[PDB]
Design a protein around this ligand. Structure first.
Ligand SMILES: [Zn+2]
Ligand SMILES: [Zn+2]
Ligand SMILES: [Zn+2]
Lengths: 62, 38, 151, 117, 58, 194, 179, 66, 171, 247
């Protein structure tokens, strides 16, 4: 930052492609799948919660 | 007739899904005939 | 034109160029090179005009005023010319240079966007890309002004 | 005028700042935290080059001599080693960039001599 | 008088003076801090530029 | 398990069968067929792969001639002014090259009374990694012997040399290996069976 | 001043022949230095798990494309060495690697840039033997084979995914377990 | 997809020559020589066979409707 | 070296080789395959294992140390595209079948789960439920996980599919 | 306007003409014919290779030693500093040119004046293959071509070319420290030396055009905006879009 401020270095260009990356089908789906799976675990949590707080046994298949 | 895929899929599935090597060979014999059969 | 530009570029590199009142050296330098290249394009265009026969059909569409102008004739027959973005010569998009094919701190004609071919001769990839850079701007402005003037 | 730079406290290694000797009327350097203190060396508190008169040589580095993307001239033998091949480029610093002045570096290893003409 | 440097840290509802961030990382002396920034103390020009931030975190 | 061992065995029996057409461009014909075997002579030697960061070749020799000089070069570990150990690279003179080549014509491994001269060229930092270290990647080399076959060896040890920062002449006289040195090869040789 | 180093060490000998080629086999090809015997065989006990298709992908290449050699004794007891791989030279100067009955292309390229050398360590020194001059590069022919389709995954060489054989009534499995 | 029956510009029948042209194409004839053999000299006619793409060969790969 | 005369031939021959080597959607096919091969497992293990503790009923009249159930996800499995008829009978799901039946060209996913319960310092019984069924993931066409993977020209048209299709899209 | 504008950085990576002319003008782009996007790979082989090299690891090095040393960033992670990075870069290049430690997607950038080494192995890096130029002479000789004209029979390919260190994949970020020739048949001769230090040569400059832009004949003989409109119009042209269209 100082270098640029001192003018010893030219500013970075947001449109310079050297500063850019393209999100392919991998990161795209991974970004989705991460959220959907992580929340899915809450479903398993609450389901087990219903049985196990009662001290009962939760069938994970459900 | 279009079941070449079905026979090929059946033979391909059996080879990895079946623990015996004989099933893949028996399917392979049918598979060679399949070029004419379809 | 290329030689004259090179000579001026070297004088500039030698810092022999006088900054006019108010303007800086770089500003007068930019002005000088642009002037020379514009003059080159204009002079070559003029020479093309003077060479066109009355059966030349671009000129027939220019003197009737129906479609085209002497500048288009210059670009097709004589030379395409300097390709500008924001009114200026092609900028050093890469670090201190316009393309990986040119060397750092290269202010030469084709190095900064001066297309030395006419469209009939076709554009070399560097000057082809410089013409692409110049042509994209018009399309973008075309797309946004409709949104400003309607309001 | 010179150029004042940052100094760190030997005690806390924090930056040291100038203070006047209110009695002897002289300049002192003192740590803003601990009373660590020493007598100042410049008599100059600050400098600000408005013209930006600068020794471009300090920011130029010899490592650029091997840059393959740098123009080379057989026309300018190295003033230090005399080697014919030298790289040349402009001073990319706001006031130096406005001046468009050129810098030359030798295309010879361990020589790397950099000069302007 | 000016040119203080602040970092917009994620989840931090307000911008934070960076010299504080270096002390917070455990690089508590200004020497340490600059050692991670001003790799070469031979730069009076750059050293003079961080002072606004150093003052804010002094 | 046995169905795969059986499948592997088939490949050895099939490998002696002759070839009659190219896998494409069938109009072409075969010049030479060679089987691939491990070099039974070379495995007993504690082989180390030396990887340099940049070209070590001697300035006076170009092309195929230059590689011959480097191929017979000798390298030694040294201890510097600060006590850090490094590697010295020594190159043979033409006379040393003649002696080394001469021994092949006389069918001798080395002459017990002769001495071989090598002079230091450059100093290098060293890193030695072998198969017992985690994540080691296998490098191989094949020796082609026309009319005989292909004999290969695996590079069990990898040495990386990078330019560092003592003008030494290495004069080496050879002797036969002792009982412990032969045992030192055989302990290394044991990775070839069971 | 010339630092004089006089040393006595045994010479380690190498028979370098006429041509030396460097070889790094891609993940779908491999080489075994021990003589192949079904007895004392390498413990390649992968299949007992009743593997999925990623496991069979690696297993198929590991079992079928691993180059091995063995010592065989004839009826008179003379030892004949058999290898399952052999290299063939063609009239146009090209080459090919043969792994049993299957055929693979071999392109000759001289080793540019990398200064890779063979040395033998003795005590504190290394005795030079050779510099690699040319390397072998391989590519599979025989596109009609099903094996070529699965080799695409071989690069996959923390857990890695598996493929079930598309088997089971899954909708029924869902419906029934949820009861 | 399949050879046009007639030359788009002039009207000469070009549908009855594609198999002949393919026979000529088996040999090392340049695309121009086949037309020369088939006697198609005006470029309007020549463009018809020179630019044709016989995709119907691909269309036959699909399973048949007994 | 290559003369200017042959450099033009060499140049288009090299480009042709590139088009033999890499198709036009290589990065997509590669990304989806990598998503299936690496990122999906990475995402699975990247989740923290669950530790659930029963809400104290205080029925004992004392501050209870309620039993807690723990789960950790292990191995991941992905079948090939599978179509189950209404009866759940599994059959290969072909892209054209999914297209005509407006199905989703997807394959079911399975994961190994170790179930656990930790009763104070008293015995805990960590147990496991292997190859549990997770949702169905659509496969990108022509990926390695497709059924039209590495399939020859004869096969694809026989599968009523186009052999020139680069893939890289989902159904 | 910048996000819609055709920046120099797009050369050879993104087609310069093929973009929608509507509100998506300049925002929506299309890839050049030889543009490849890194799928991504782990840095682990490289990290140990760096740690064993003459790199003072960042976790190990003294601040004073960082001044006259390049800072190495891997996937942007600053991991250490190096005192003679040219030797490092030579090694790193040598490795990539063999596809050994350094896989073929990785991009290693040495900022000479800046003293930075940025190594990227992650995914999403758009890159393209380029010819390597060591001297003012090609790495690609007739033996490669002779093998390749027969590529119909023998499968000689890119893998052999890169594994042999004749071709290399340069990423946009790395393309700033390479000196690139357009053609070896002309940029290896000289009249008055312009560069004399080329590092790469374009395989073929027409490969900067995209899919719709590559059907255009004589695109350098047209005003570029017209080319853009054709590029757009190539997306509206009717035709046989697939062989199973009847199914
Ligand atoms: Zn203090
Ligand atoms: Zn010099
Ligand atoms: Zn006609």
């Amino acid at each position: 930052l100082l270098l640029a401020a001192l003018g010893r270095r030219e500013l970075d260009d947001r449109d310079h492609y050297g500063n850019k990356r393209l999100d392919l089908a991998g990161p795209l789906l991974a970004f989705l799948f991460r959220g959907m799976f992580k929340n899915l675990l809450k479903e398993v949590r609450i389901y087990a919660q219903k049985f196990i707080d009662r001290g009962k046994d939760f069938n994970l298949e459900l | 007739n279009y079941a070449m895929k079905k026979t090929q899929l059946l033979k391909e599935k059996a080879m990895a899904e079946d623990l015996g090597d004989q099933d893949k060979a028996k399917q392979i014999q049918d598979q060679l005939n399949e070029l004419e059969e379809r | 034109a290329k030689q004259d530009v090179i000579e001026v570029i070297e004088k500039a590199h030698n810092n022999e160029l006088e900054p006019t009142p108010g303007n800086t050296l770089r500003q007068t330098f930019e002005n000088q090179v642009n002037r020379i290249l514009n003059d080159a394009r204009d002079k070559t265009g003029s020479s093309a005009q003077k060479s066109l026969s009355e059966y030349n059909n671009f000129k027939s569409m220019v003197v009737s005023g129906a479609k085209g102008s002497k500048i288009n004739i210059s670009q097709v027959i004589a030379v395409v010319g300097q390709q500008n973005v924001e009114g200026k010569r092609i900028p050093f998009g890469f670090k201190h240079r316009t393309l990986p094919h040119f060397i750092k701190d290269d202010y030469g004609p084709e190095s900064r966007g001066f297309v030395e071919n006419s469209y009939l001769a076709g554009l070399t990839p560097t000057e082809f890309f410089f013409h692409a850079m110049g042509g994209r701007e018009g399309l973008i402005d075309t797309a946004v002004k409709t949104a400003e003037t309607g309001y | 005028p010179g150029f004042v730079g940052i100094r760190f406290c030997q005690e806390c290694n924090n930056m040291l700042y100038p203070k006047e000797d209110k009695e002897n009327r002289i300049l002192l350097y003192a740590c803003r935290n601990c009373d660590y203190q020493q007598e100042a060396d410049n008599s100059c508190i600050y400098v600000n080059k408005i013209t930006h008169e600068v020794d471009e040589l300090t920011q130029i580095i010899a490592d650029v001599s091997q840059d393959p993307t740098l123009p080379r001239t057989e026309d300018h033998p190295c003033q230090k080693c005399g080697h014919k091949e030298a790289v040349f480029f402009q001073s990319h610093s706001a006031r130096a960039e406005d001046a468009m002045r050129l810098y030359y570096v030798c295309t010879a290893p361990h020589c790397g001599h950099r000069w302007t003409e | 008088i000016g040119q203080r440097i602040v970092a917009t840290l994620p989840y931090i509802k307000q911008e934070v003076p960076i010299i504080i961030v270096f002390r917070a990382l455990g690089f508590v002396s200004d020497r340490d801090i600059l050692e991670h920034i001003i790799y070469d103390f031979e730069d009076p020009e750059m050293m003079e530029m961080v002072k606004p931030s150093l003052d804010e975190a002094f | 398990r046995d169905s795969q061992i059986t499948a592997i065995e088939k490949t050895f029996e099939d490998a002696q069968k002759s070839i009659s057409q190219h896998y494409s461009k069938p109009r072409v014909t075969p010049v030479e067929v060679m089987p691939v075997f491990p070099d039974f002579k070379m495995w007993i030697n504690p082989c180390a792969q030396v990887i340099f960061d940049s070209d070590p070749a001697p300035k006076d020799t170009s092309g195929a001639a230059a590689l011959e000089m480097m191929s017979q070069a000798m390298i030694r570990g040294m201890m510097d002014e600060e006590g850090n150990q490094f590697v010295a690279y020594f190159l043979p003179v033409e006379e040393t090259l003649k002696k080394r080549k001469r021994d092949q014509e006389e069918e001798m491994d080395y002459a017990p009374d002769d001495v071989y001269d090598y002079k230091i060229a450059r100093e290098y930092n060293w890193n030695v990694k072998n198969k017992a270290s985690k994540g080691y990647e296998e490098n191989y080399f094949f020796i082609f012997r026309e009319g005989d076959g292909v004999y290969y060896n695996e590079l069990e040890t990898r040495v990386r040399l990078s330019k560092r920062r003592t003008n030494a002449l290495l004069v080496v006289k050879h002797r036969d290996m002792n009982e412990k040195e032969l045992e030192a090869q055989e302990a290394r040789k044991a990775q070839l069976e069971n | 001043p010339e630092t004089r180093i006089e040393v006595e060490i045994p010479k380690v000998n190498t028979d370098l022949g006429n041509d030396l080629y460097f070889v790094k086999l891609p993940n779908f090809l491999s080489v075994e230095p021990r003589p192949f015997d079904p007895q004392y065989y390498e413990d390649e006990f992968e299949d007992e798990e009743m593997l999925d298709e990623e496991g069979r992908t690696r297993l198929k290449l590991k079992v079928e494309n691993t180059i091995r050699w063995r010592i065989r004794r004839d009826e008179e007891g003379n030892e004949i060495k058999e290898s399952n791989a052999r290299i063939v030279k063609w009239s146009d100067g090209s080459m090919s690697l043969h792994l049993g009955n299957e055929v693979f292309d071999v392109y000759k390229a001289p080793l540019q840039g990398d200064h890779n050398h063979l040395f033998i360590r003795q005590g504190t020194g290394l005795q030079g033997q050779a510099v690699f001059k040319t390397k072998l590069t391989f590519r599979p022919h025989s596109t009609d084979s099903a094996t070529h389709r699965k080799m695409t995954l071989s690069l996959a060489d923390t857990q890695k995914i598996r493929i079930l054989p598309m088997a089971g009534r899954d909708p029924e499995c869902q419906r029934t377990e949820m009861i | 997809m399949i050879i046009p029956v007639r030359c788009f510009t002039c009207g000469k029948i070009v549908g009855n020559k594609w198999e002949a042209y393919l026979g000529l194409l088996q040999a090392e004839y340049t695309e121009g020589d086949a037309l020369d053999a088939l006697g198609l000299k005006r470029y309007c006619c020549r463009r018809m066979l020179l630019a044709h793409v016989d995709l119907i060969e691909k269309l036959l790969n699909y399973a048949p409707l007994e | 070296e290559i003369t200017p005369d042959l450099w033009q031939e060499a140049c288009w021959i090299v480009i042709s080789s590139y088009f033999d080597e890499k198709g036009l959607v290589r990065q997509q096919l590669d990304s989806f395959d990598e998503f299936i091969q690496m990122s999906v497992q990475r995402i699975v293990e990247d989740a923290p294992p669950i530790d659930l503790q029963a809400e104290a009923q205080h029925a004992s009249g004392e501050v209870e140390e309620p039993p807690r159930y723990l789960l950790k996800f292990e191995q991941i499995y992905l079948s090939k595209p599978t179509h189950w008829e209404r009866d759940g009978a599994p059959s290969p799901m072909m892209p054209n079948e999914a297209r005509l039946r407006n199905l989703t060209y997807s394959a079911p996913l399975y994961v190994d789960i170790t179930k656990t319960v930790i009763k104070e310092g008293e015995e805990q019984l960590q147990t496991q439920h292997q190859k549990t069924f997770i949702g169905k993931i659509p496969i990108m066409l022509r990926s390695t996980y497709c059924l039209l993977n590495g399939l020859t020209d004869r096969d694809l048209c026989e599968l009523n599919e186009c052999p020139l299709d680069p893939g890289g899209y989902f159904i | 306007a910048k996000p819609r504008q055709l920046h120099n950085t797009l050369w050879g990576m993104v087609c310069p003409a093929e973009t929608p002319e509507g509100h998506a003008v300049g925002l929506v782009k299309n890839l050049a014919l030889m543009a490849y996007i890194s799928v991504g790979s782990q840095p682990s082989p490289i990290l140990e290779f760096l740690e064993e090299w003459s790199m003072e690891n960042l976790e190990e090095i003294s601040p004073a030693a960082i001044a006259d040393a390049t800072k190495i960033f891997v996937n942007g992670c600053w991991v250490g500093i190096h005192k003679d990075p040219e030797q490092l870069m030579n090694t790193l290049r040598k490795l990539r040119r063999q596809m050994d430690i350094i896989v073929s997607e990785v991009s290693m950038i040495r900022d000479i004046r800046e003293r930075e080494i940025r190594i990227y192995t992650d995914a999403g890096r758009i890159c393209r293959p380029l010819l390597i130029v060591e001297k003012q002479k090609l790495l690609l000789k007739k033996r490669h071509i002779d093998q390749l004209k027969e590529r119909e029979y023998n499968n000689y390919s890119w893998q052999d070319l890169v594994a042999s260190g004749v071709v290399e994949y340069i990423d946009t970020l790395e393309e700033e420290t390479v000196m690139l020739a357009m053609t070896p048949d002309d940029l290896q001769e000289k009249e008055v030396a312009y560069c004399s230090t080329y590092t790469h040569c374009e395989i073929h400059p027409s490969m900067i055009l995209g899919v719709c832009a590559s059907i255009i004949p004589f695109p350098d003989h047209n005003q570029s905006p017209r080319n853009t409109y054709q590029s757009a119009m190539g997306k509206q042209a009717m035709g046989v879009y697939i062989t199973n269209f009847h199914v």
